[model samples]
Target chain A: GSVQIVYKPVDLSKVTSKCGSLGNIHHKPGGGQVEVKSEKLDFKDRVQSKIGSLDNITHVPGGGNKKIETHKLTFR
Target chain B: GSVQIVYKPVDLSKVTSKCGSLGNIHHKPGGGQVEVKSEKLDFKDRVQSKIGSLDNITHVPGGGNKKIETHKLTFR
Candidate 1:
């Protein structure tokens, strides 16, 4: 299956307006961003795991003036 | 064992302050944040790869006002 995405504020104090968590960044200004990438985990392997893979993700700083480009990955 | 974290300014123009170079967001105004998580690489798997795993991460938009929350993961 595809990766499950979820977005929530790291600091409650900064949550000016609850933007309703989904799987994407919703804040502006100095607010932070968090991205998680996951994949299915096969059970035939040594670690017979059904749990998929996960990655703690974030945005690249200074990639732009007012907007930051999202992270990009190429899976083999 | 754990994941490798790397944070560098994507846009140099926005990085007003040089916050070293380890792996963390450093800047003011319209800066950004980046986080990476990697576990141990096991051989003999379908992908005999020394490179554990990689994910393209980002931040949630409009979840807060100031200071973003860092990503968290619960490995199985």
Candidate 2:
């Protein structure tokens, strides 16, 4: 398990604007990144995904916490 | 060498980094997180290559203070 800040952006289209960090994922406003659980999608979807939308997004940390976690996902 | 901040997105691909922040290592245009000493190895290698070209990234923190010996070192 690990405890680190994440960057989950705000999805305007999702009605509820669950945004991530507009600034430092560790600072105020948006309280950094959140933890997600996906043990199945680990070693998959690599080679780099499209650099996708940066503004309209919720940078959720890919998964799990009982571990050091996914390279520290930070979505600014 | 005691401090309370650090943020280095520097090129550790060279195999090391001279990072350690205190004040706010907290802000910089190209500055964010330098205390990246725990993000496993694979992620470390990947980021090193891509963002490595960023070249000599630097960011100074705010004033005020704390107390933590800043551990400094270099890579190459």
Off by over 4 Å in 1: A1-55, A58-76, B1-45, B48-56, B59-61, B64-76
Worst 10 residues of 2 chain B by lDDT: B13-22
Best by TM-score: 1
Please name the candidate that would achieve the greatest DockQ relative to the true structure. Answer: 1
Full-model lDDT, candidate 1? 0.31
Clash count, candidate 2: 27
**Model 2 agreement with the true structure over B1-76: per-residue lDDT tens digits:** 3232233323211111122221221311222333322332243222312221212222323121222223233322
Docking class of 2: incorrect
**Each candidate's fnat, in order?**
0.09, 0.00
lDDT of 1 at A71: 39
Q: Which CAPRI category fits model 1?
A: incorrect
